[PDB]
Every structure is written in structure tokens, then in C-alpha cells.
Symmetry: D2
Subunit: 244 residues, 4 copies
């Protein structure tokens, strides 16, 4: 099954046409969606005007286990991967625009697998060995996560990082600056301008995101379902662990 | 005259609909375009598939004085076919361009975007003590050899808006150690490229962008691999920048 | 009264010879020591092998009001025997932090164990004027993380009138700036503090005593001596609430 | 031979007592000085007022091949690293020493390497840098010392960039590794008196001359010894490019 997929930026993001999202999509469409999600890191569905607080939650149930019973209304201008201060942080979120500012209000995603891949080999090798402490609850995650479906390596960083374990503060700051700077390099990002009825789904294991706070008092309302994820595994196979 | 203007991001950029760019636009249209340009910093016209090399050039002349190896059949049109580094155009000279008019001839199916940053918005968000510091700084800009000393803050000659004048031609902040120069640049340039002060455009063949080079920087995203990307540009002559205290930029070398 | 004063580095630090520190030092000598302290920021007295715990505490009371688990047989003497290898001004997470310490070497490593002081008045004075003007307007939050205090980045010294940067490792953030801006501005200003020309390094021998003006210095204890014993004993003197260039006072915001 | 050696800082520097430097020192003494030089990275001889330019150079010829120059250098560097075979050592004598100020600081770039966490040493072992006098040379960031085998960071102010990285990454990586070099624990500061002589191993140090003495006269006289092309951890050699 080939969906009608239209890449949005060169290294991340794709719009999927011809699909009305619903709790009654079959296992095949769910699978082609999950595959697009893995390949493109964030996928977009426009015109899901037909969709409702309950029909979104039951679409979401098809992709994983939510963490209406689960649909959260939001009514975040810092680069982050969702909830990384816990061990088994979410694998994905499904986000629907309900009220969209007429100007401003965009979201940007970064591809943390592309960010890893473009590092020179010596720097990849260092990242492979690093651990970082994330806090809001404190958890140690490897800086490089091996993705449990695709096998792709991805940088696990973002604003919940308090320090790189084993380094002085100065060194921690520099090493984080280098690696996070590859994540947010423009080439690794896609920016989406929302219209009501849009739906984005992103793979939280291989992205970061940032909500642009340029819309002043214009109302902006989105509704999110977050899917439960796995404990990350590093390149050497060690698992993330909570510490505080 | 009110053009059909649609802001693209919150702090920068606007698409103008209902206008067919040409050398024959009337005074009211040209004035409203110039006003939108100063207000929005970068403006976009989609669907200009009628606009050819000569017409793009004749249109550009309604906005200013084009400056110049050019596209055949023109005197000023430059072909670009990468600039993935934040900059303000040609700031290593004293009277750098005021504007460019850029048309998409061939646009990659995925990737190829351009981002602009509003350097007036970036100035305005600085805490007051940092604004006051920025108002006193001068920076050396270079192509390395031309070098020019510009004020860090330029007072726009039409709007009076203050704008940071930085980007990748900056060699150093004058009068500071190297370490200090790097830190102060990082702070001020960092405000320029903050996402909130930026607009990203995804090109389609026939799109035209026009930007105010006095109050922007821009960056061409190099994410499109070998997909052809061909754009053609006319650059318009600008003025010698004036700082907050009235002092003028000056070339200091070759 | 003119002491026998020998500058150690060009911009900070001076050894004072011919003086035996004690609780009975006369007022003219004490006054001259106070002046030398303000001028030189850290002063050094070698060969004070007669000084014992009680006589150090007694001497210390001549220069100020000691502040207080102390060494036995004293009220205020603190033993440090490890490590403070990070640039700081003492206790700046409180509002009225110490004005001075009097530190005596009891056991000094045969190699290593130095202390370095930086002149934060010299650091301020070397900033280009626009940067001095910015520094004059900044405030920083200092924290022991739990106490936090807002201090101006520039302190006007209450004796000399000299302006001095008030920074170091207790600084959590520069108030009113993003994290990234706070980091860069701290790095610039702290970097002038630790520039080598603004520093003096002392290698300790048992019976050495150093006195420093904590209002116009930072210091760093070099941790290069491994397991060699290092024991020093310190009396800290109470200080005043700092005053900024515009007259505003520091303020504690959490206690 | 056991010289009377007195370590100055914890991780670098030693004063050597009871030796009058001259062209006539015996082989046992010269060998012991060379050993102390390699161990301590910089060594100091005080009271060498009997020396003059000729005698300083005769003594220096016992340690290597000269390439006396009379001498502001307040920037951390290793000497002339913009050339491929930069000096192995210098011998520097104080002729006039300011009464206050005028110190020199050395850093031990072998200690700086050793203290890096293992993953960061492994990265450093793989990096190359371009050094320039703006003459440009590519040197490994880690040099394997040809006598002791100790690994040492080869950085300092002649570095223009770390090869293969963006400007931003090069800046940050340099800041990290150079920051370990100049960490106070890896340094020794010397206050000069006329007649003092310092000898340092330019393969495993950097130095900085403190500019705090105003217009006080400061006169030093230096003899520099020729050195070898550096070898990196993988055996590759430095190479001049421009
Ligand atoms: Na989020
Ligand atoms: Na450009
Ligand atoms: Na202290
Ligand atoms: Na030199």
C-alpha cells in the first residue's frame, strides 16, 4: 500500500493526501501511516474537519496506547523531545488544530536521526558513548538512541537535558551546544503553518519540536493525544534508567 | 490603495495577492508595494509565471536603481543555481544593497526553502541595557579584500526603525578582544535568528520575493541535494548606513 | 606609617614583611594593613609560625567581626582540609556576604596546593566603556543550589569607591535575560576576572597567612596536589550589604 | 645521577638546584637534565648570572641543535606550530626582570590530555587541526611524544580551525580541549629574577607571558632547539599545506 505522500522539506516532513483519519481505518492503512511516520518523522493531514474529540482519540488508539478519555486541549517555544525526563517517554503525538491564528503560531520539528547522520565519524563515535541527565523526576538516557523499529540512530537531547554525565560543566555545555546545534540546523527542520482541521503526527523517538510564540493574543487551540513509548536503548544496548 | 496583503508569520513576511508584477505598474501600486516591503520586510507574490527576465528587470527599476556575469538579454539579472549561512547582502561595502527581487525559475519538489529574519524585531526585543550597548557598537565586515566598519545598529532611512546589522560578513566587533567579540556577536546574532523573528518560504516556480536588505538577513536552506534550483535576482542600490548617533559607515580597506 | 610592602604580581597581591601578626598589634599597624588590603586586594605574611589558633582569631578581631563546626578552643576558626577549585567570591548567595578572610597555612603540600586570587576591580576597569556601562546596569541571581540573592553585577566598594565585578560560581543567572544571553554575558565578564594579568598565585609554606578583600576579589584553590595533606585555617569577617552604581542595594529573594 | 630537583606545581614544573649551567657539563648531568625536562615539562635554574649569550648557546648545544635572540606574548601557544617541524625546546634566561609583574606560565598538554574522559580522548586522537601564522600546517591534535611516548594536546593560538568541522563545531571542540590545557591545575607560574633560566619541552607544553609590568624593562634571551615532525596516535605525520 502506497499512500499519496508529498515531502514538505528535504530531510523531514511529509503531507499525506487522500486519507480521512478515523477509528475505523484498517490495519494496512494504519501500517502505511506508521511507515510514513518512521520515514518522514512528522506527517501532516489537512482537512480533517470531519474529526472530533472522540474520533481522534480512537484514531490514536490504532497507533499505540494513549497515556473523551485521553484527548488533551492546549490553548512551548523551546526545542525539546516530549517528556524525556522519564524513562519510557512517549513514542508519538497526534495533534489537531482546533483554532489557528491567522498569522503566526507555527510548529517546527527537527529530525534528530538526520542530525546524527551528518556528524563527522569521530563525533558520531563520541556521541555513541555519551549519556545525559534529563530532568523537569531525573532520568539518564544515552545521547544516541537506536530506534526500535527502524534501527536508525538519533540524538536524544533537547531542553530537558541538565548535563552530559561524566563531564565538567564547561565541557557539558560545549558538547551539548555542538550536538543540539546539529539538531536545530535549518536543513534538519520543517516548519508547519496550521489551519483548523490539520493533524500532525510525529515520531518522538527521532524528533524534537518547537512551537513558535509569534502570535501575540490571537487564540490558538490544539488537541493532543500522546502515545506510550518504550525504554530507549543505546548503541551498546544499555537502557535508560530513572535516578531521582 | 489597499493591497490584498496576507501576513505569513507573526513578526515578518506577507504574501500580496491580486498583483501581476510588470514594468507597467502604476504609482499607487508601486507605493503600496514599497510600504508593504518596509512594514513586512519580505513580501511574496505567487503565480508570476508571466514574468520573464526583461520584465523582472523592468519591474525592479520601478523600486530602485539596479546594480550589477548577468543573464543573457539583461543588464542586471543574476542567476543563482549555496547560501546556507545567515547574512545581510554585501555588508562588506559601505553602501550595500537596499533590496533584492528574486524570482523562482526552477524550484525543487522538496526542499529549497529560503528563510528571512527581521533584524528590527530582533533589536526591539533586546532588554534595554543590551539595546543601549548595541547602539554603541561597530563591527568590521569583510569579504575575506574589502573591509567596512558599520554600526551594529542601523537607523532605517525610511521608517527610522532600528535594526541589527550583523550576519556572516562580520569579522569582529571593533574595540573588543576576540573572545568578547565572539560572545557579543553570538548574543546579538542569536536574537536575529530566533525562530519567532523568522519566516520560511517554500518556493514554487513563478514565485517572486522582495526583501528589505536594511532590516533583514536571510539563509538559503541546502536540503535539496541535486534537485535543480534556479533563481534570478535583481539587486537594488542602497545608502550608506547611519547609526543611532548619526555616524556613517566607512570603508577602511581596499 | 609605611609598611615594608612588596607587590607579588603587577595588578594584585603584595607581601608585607617585618610584621608579626597577633592580637596585640598596635592600631597604626592595623590601619596600615587595612589600607594595604584595600589597595592590593590580597596581602601575604610569611613566617607567622608563632601564630596559633587563638592568636589568629584574636588578630582577626582587630580587622573586623568574625562570623561563625569550628576548630577546638576557638569560636570562629574554620579548618579546610579537603576542594575549592572553582572561581568564586565567598558566600555571595547571601545579601551581606563576608568582607574578608584571614587564612593561615598549617600543613602545605611540598608540591601543588596553590591559591589564586583575581582582582575584580581591575577586571571592571579594563572593560571598554560601553561594556562597563552595560555591567553597571546588570543584576545577577546568586544561589547556593537554599538561599538566593540578587546582587548588582558591579559593586561600589564601601571604603575605596572602586567598582568591582560581583560574579563567580554562585551566579545562577543574569536577571532579565534568556539563558543563552545570560551565559554569554557571564562568560564575557567572568572572563575578564580570570584573565591571567588580573591574578596572583601564591604557593603556601606552613605559617603563611593571606588576607583578602572579598568585596574586590575572587579566588580559586588549585587541586593539583593529590593525597598530599593540606590544612588551612580561616577566620571570616562580616561584610556589608553591597551597593550598586545607582545606589540600589542587594536583596535576598529566597531564604 | 640524582639532581637536586624540587617540583614547583603539582602537575608541572621543577626547580633544579646545584647545577651551574655551561657548555662543559658532563654527559651524566646533561642526561639527567633531559630526563627532568621530559618528566616536569619545564625546569628552572636560578642564579645563573655567570651565563652570557655565548655560554647560553654552548650549554644549549648540549641539549640539541639551535635554530641568542633577545626579547608581547600574552596568549597561550606552543612555539611556531605553523611549521611542520617546530622546536622541541627553548632555553630562556632572564637578563632584566621587572620588580613586579612579568611572570610566565606554562601548561602541561600531556596532563591536559590524560584528564579527558576516555570518549573525549578517543575523539581528540582522531582530530587534525590547521595551524597558521596569519604559512599553514596540518597537525594532529594529539602528538605522541618521540621520547616518552606520552600523548599531548597540540593546540594553542596558531590553530585556525579543526579540520573537517563547521566553524561552530571547530570553535566548541577547540574550546573544550584548549580549556583543559589552561585549567589552573595543569599550569605553573614563574616569577623571574635576573639570572634565572627556564627550559621547556615545547612538545608537551604551552606558555603565556603575563603582560602586567607596564613600562618596566624586561629582557630575556632565548635559544631555541630544532624539533621533529609530529606523529599522531595512528602514526600519521604532520604536513605543511601552504
Ligand atoms: Na511538547
Ligand atoms: Na544573499
Ligand atoms: Na572561598
Ligand atoms: Na613564544
Amino acid at each position: 500500500l502506497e499512500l499519496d505522500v508529498h515531502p514538505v522539506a528535504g530531510r523531514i516532513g511529509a503531507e499525506i493526501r487522500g486519507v480521512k483519519l478515523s477509528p475505523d481505518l484498517d490495519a494496512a492503512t494504519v501500517e502505511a501511516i506508521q511507515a510514513a511516520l518512521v520515514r518522514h518523522k512528522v506527517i501532516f493531514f489537512r482537512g480533517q474537519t470531519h474529526l472530533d474529540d472522540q474520533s481522534q482519540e480512537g484514531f490514536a488508539k490504532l497507533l499505540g496506547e494513549p497515556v473523551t478519555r485521553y484527548l488533551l486541549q492546549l490553548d512551548a517555544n523551546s526545542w525539546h523531545t516530549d517528556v524525556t525526563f522519564v524513562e519510557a517517554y512517549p513514542k508519538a503525538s497526534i495533534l489537531r488544530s482546533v483554532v489557528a491564528p491567522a498569522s503566526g503560531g507555527d510548529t517546527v520539528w527537527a529530525n534528530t536521526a538526520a542530525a546524527y547522520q551528518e556528524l563527522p565519524e569521530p563525533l558520531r563515535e563520541l556521541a555513541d558513548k555519551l549519556w545525559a541527565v534529563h530532568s523537569n523526576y531525573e532520568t539518564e538516557h544515552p545521547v544516541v538512541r537506536v530506534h526500535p523499529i527502524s534501527g536508525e540512530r538519533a540524538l536524544q537531547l533537547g531542553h530537558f537535558v541538565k548535563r552530559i554525565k561524566g563531564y565538567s560543566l564547561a565541557d557539558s555545555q560545549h558538547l551539548f551546544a555542538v550536538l543540539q546545534g546539529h539538531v536545530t540546523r535549518l536543513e534538519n527542520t520543517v516548519r508547519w503553518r496550521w489551519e483548523a482541521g490539520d493533524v500532525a503526527i510525529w515520531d518522538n523517538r527521532a524528533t524534537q519540536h518547537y512551537a513558535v510564540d509569534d502570535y501575540g493574543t490571537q487564540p490558538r487551540i490544539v488537541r493532543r493525544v500522546t502515545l506510550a513509548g518504550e525504554v530507549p536503548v543505546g548503541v551498546d544496548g544499555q537502557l535508560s534508567r530513572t535516578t531521582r
